[PDB]
Design a binder for these strands. Structure first.
Ligand SMILES: [Mg+2]
Ligand SMILES: [Zn+2]
Lengths: 114, 55, 104, 98, 67
RNA sequence: AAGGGCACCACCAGGAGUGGAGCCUGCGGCUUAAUUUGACCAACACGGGAAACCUCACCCGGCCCGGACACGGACAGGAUUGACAGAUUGAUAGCUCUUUCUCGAUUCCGUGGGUGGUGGUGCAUGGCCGUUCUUAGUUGGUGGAGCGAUUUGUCUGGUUAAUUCCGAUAACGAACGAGACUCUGGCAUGCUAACUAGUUACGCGACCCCCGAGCGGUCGGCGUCCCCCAACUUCUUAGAGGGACAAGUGGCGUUCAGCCACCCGAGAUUGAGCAAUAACAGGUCUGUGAUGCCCUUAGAUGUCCGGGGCUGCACGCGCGCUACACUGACUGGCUCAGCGUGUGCCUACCCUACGCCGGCAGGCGCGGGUAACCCGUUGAACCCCAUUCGUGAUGGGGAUCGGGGAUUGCAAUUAUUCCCCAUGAACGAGGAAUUCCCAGUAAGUGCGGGUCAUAAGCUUGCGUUGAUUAAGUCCCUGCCCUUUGUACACACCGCC
């Protein structure tokens, strides 16, 4: 109805949300090996999967980082309470993730390697 | 200045009202489909949004 | 109970949308529901043509970006109540569903 | 920054209540979406956290147009004594159910 | 540069001594030597100005000229 | 210099033009306080750059700190914050100023140190993009020839749009590019379906009929998923599939690679997207919380507010619009589209049916649409059919200019746009030159999208009407391969 946004604007909005979420995670989990983000959004609650090489890092001590990131994305995008979760998964074959290798090369060059 | 002229100028419309949602720029904006994004920024995030290139 | 529900599906890639259209209707046949065929609404093409350059200097090249939106409608209309009979949507990421009765 | 004390405490307890802070980079925005009732301007929120970052009690990440401050352990005890708390109350991020 | 206007003087507050603007008599009966701000939010605690023709509340901004 | 091949960013044969006129717009110049600035095939309706404010970077002024943090002073006997009146100011900026109130540790001063910057540097850079080049080109490994740079592979020849293939072969085996690929167009009375698409049928009507038709003709009038209260998918939509392969015939060819013609076929070459090695001191620091260095940082090169400018005109150029008329203009009648948009995180601003008022632009109420449901059977233009004009700068052309009326906005003057009445200027097919183009193409013609409170002479797409010429060449301008010459290597815009 009137409250609902049109499908044309709607599907553009979801692409905007994914692009904005990817950029935020790219800047934050860069040194942690962030590979990509998968968003399985459902009408009831959405869910966000973070693809990173070093999962025990994206999840801090007792999962403080993930709880923070879950709260941080909750406030920015106005998600309703308890309707969004963040999962962290290890990406298989990290040598075939161009993002992971490019981030690894960035870290090596910043270290001082030739 | 004092609370009655710092932002006093009306900005309900025009280029000043609208800025890129990514880089806060006011030039070459794309307000179609509710993007509100920069001409250059859209080319950067076109793949992530879903705008692929067919022809 | 007596119910009639209009299920509308919308996505970007046809392969997933055609897949999800299958298991709802195929699940309903096993559930011996009546199923009007999946009506294919005309595909919406969102076309944004942006100049390729970020400088304004060049040979006036323009970049054509297309976004295809595909909509499909499935009308599950069994004699008995349907919401309890169809308690699942069994979707995949990328497709949006909107359960809707005849009142809307 | 010349923000009133009531606004400054309002930012701090909100930052403590959940150990994260999100604010859009807009100094002319009349009110922060959270704490709109306190009538704290968005400018006060941005500048208050900038002071915390320089002192090291918070770490800042900026996306397109939103700050994403995360309260650190060095900020746990500082907000604890500013609001006069013994080491028992934690931000939501620090503990859930444990 | 070489701007024609001389650099504008910015205000330095006078630095006033402690208020002490109410006195007593014969070992102490209170007598406010200024004016009370009558508004609800000014209240009793604050006092009004004593200009040469009006009285002014620092918070409530009320002004009372005797013409 | 020779031998071969190729290209409407080359020509030929033509078409439409541009250059000539008025106007729009972008450059240069001139002018200015400023008329911000980049760019000079591959700049000049380009920076998505249609700027009243904002944008804004320029000019004339006026506020603010949005100068973190540390250290030292200063301070609850007040560090500091706001403010009424008068003056003052462009200003209802307590910016100053008299005046005292008020605030309460949030600041204030100094020293270090931030931070910001549409400030410089694209000749410090990333990324992107343009171009060399959309031509067919490019590179290892092992082997061979060389003292060596290098060379062979990567070729005499035939063929191809293509170092594409066929073949010889000190080369063999490969890699990228091309091709394959992706999207789109053309055909499927074959499949799946559709009360958000329809068609046929039936039943109601409404009319014309009437001779009498009667299963008559017309209806975008109404029903039959208002589920029992039609079918079907031809037309519409969109999925899975099929279809075209030089497949068949004849000829040419080393009878190989392939080429030409024809039958059957919707189609025997539909358009795009992607697009190699190497490079350019090509463009962008004015897209970015991309960035190095430098500069500025409280009388700011930060930021905000007011006004002006970006439009300014002896002149030169570029992209276009309108025309010069009768193959026309005007007035009326008739009758046909397709892309595609439509109410907003911030964010204020949507597309509009119908009724009424008005001559028009418009105004006022009532609805519909977050959309195959409403605008909308998108009743578009050209065109078509009738009328007037009649070869004159004329009813061509509508520039310039006066008066008046609306809409947007906080604000319309240097006219935002629109409407009405008046003036009716050059212009009678445009010198030398020069652009684009091979079939639903050029061109005529309108309609959407972007920009957009207001708006298109721009651009990006769409449909409509629909040709002339050509199936060739290297003549001009260039490209590719081989041979050759060279005093050239910043590479003929070279050297001397
Ligand atoms: Mg006339
Ligand atoms: Zn942008």
């Amino acid at each position: 109805m009137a409250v609902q946004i049109s499908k044309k604007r709607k599907f553009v909005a979801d692409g905007i949300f994914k692009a904005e979420l990817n950029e935020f995670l790219t800047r934050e989990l860069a040194e942690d090996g962030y590979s990509g983000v998968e968003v399985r959004v459902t009408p009831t609650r959405t869910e966000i999967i973070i693809l990173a090489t070093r999962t025990q890092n994206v999840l801090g001590e007792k999962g403080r980082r993930i709880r923070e990131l879950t709260a941080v994305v909750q406030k920015r995008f106005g998600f309703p309470e308890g309707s969004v979760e963040l999962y962290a998964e290890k990406v298989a074959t990290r040598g075939l993730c161009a993002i992971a290798q490019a981030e690894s090369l960035r870290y090596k060059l910043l270290g001082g390697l030739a | 200045g004092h609370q009655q002229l710092y932002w006093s100028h009306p900005r309900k419309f025009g280029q000043g009202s609208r800025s890129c949602r990514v880089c806060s720029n006011r030039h070459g904006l794309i307000r179609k489909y509710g993007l509100n994004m920069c001409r250059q920024c859209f080319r950067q995030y076109a793949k992530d949004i879903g705008f692929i290139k067919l022809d | 109970a007596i119910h009639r529900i209009r299920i509308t599906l919308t996505s970007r890639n046809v392969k997933s949308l055609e897949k999800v259209c299958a298991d709802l209707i195929r699940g309903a046949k096993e559930k011996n529901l009546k199923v009007k065929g999946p009506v294919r609404m005309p595909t919406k093409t969102l076309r944004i043509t942006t100049r390729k350059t970020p400088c304004g200097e060049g040979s006036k090249t323009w970049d054509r970006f297309q976004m295809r939106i595909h909509k499909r409608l499935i009308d599950l209309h069994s004699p008995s109540e349907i919401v309890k009979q169809i308690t699942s949507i069994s979707i995949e990421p990328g497709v949006e569903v909107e359960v809707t009765i005849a009142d809307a | 920054m010349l923000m009133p004390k009531k606004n400054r405490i309002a930012i701090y307890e909100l930052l403590f209540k959940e150990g994260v802070m999100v604010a859009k980079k807009d100094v002319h925005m009349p009110k922060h979406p959270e704490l709109a009732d306190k009538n704290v301007p968005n400018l006060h929120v941005m500048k208050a956290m900038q002071s915390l970052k320089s002192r090291g009690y918070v770490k800042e990440q900026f996306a397109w147009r939103h700050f994403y401050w995360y309260l650190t352990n060095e900020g746990i005890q500082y907000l604890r004594d500013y609001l006069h708390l013994p080491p028992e109350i934690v931000p939501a991020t620090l503990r859930r159910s444990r | 540069y070489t701007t024609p206007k001389k650099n504008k003087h910015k205000r330095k507050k006078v630095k006033l001594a402690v208020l002490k603007y109410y006195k007593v008599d014969e070992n102490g009966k209170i007598s406010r030597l200024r004016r009370e701000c009558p508004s609800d939010e000014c209240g009793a605690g604050v006092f009004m100005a004593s200009h040469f023709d009006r009285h002014y509340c620092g918070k409530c901004c009320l002004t009372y000229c005797f013409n």
